[PDB]
Ligand binder design. Structure first.
Ligand code: NA
Length: 51
DNA sequence: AATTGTGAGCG
DNA sequence: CGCTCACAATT
């Protein structure tokens, strides 16, 4: 399956791969609508942890 | 001060 | 190349 990285969800959502990382781990500085976009994205793309 | 991006450092 | 961790320079 399509190896959906953080970079991929991040690009689609409207955020940097760092921020989508700090949704998962080192979680900090993912603000209201940007985090809503990642919560959207997590479903709209089927993210693969580590690849 | 608030986050991104740079860097750094492990995977 | 993939992800986490903390930090400062831009803003
Ligand atoms: Na992860």
């Amino acid at each position: 399956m399509k190896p959906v990285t953080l970079y991929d969800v991040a690009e689609y959502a409207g955020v940097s791969y760092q921020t989508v990382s700090r949704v998962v781990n080192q979680a900090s500085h993912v603000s209201a609508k940007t985090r809503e976009k990642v919560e959207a994205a997590m479903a709209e793309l089927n993210y693969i942890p580590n690849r």
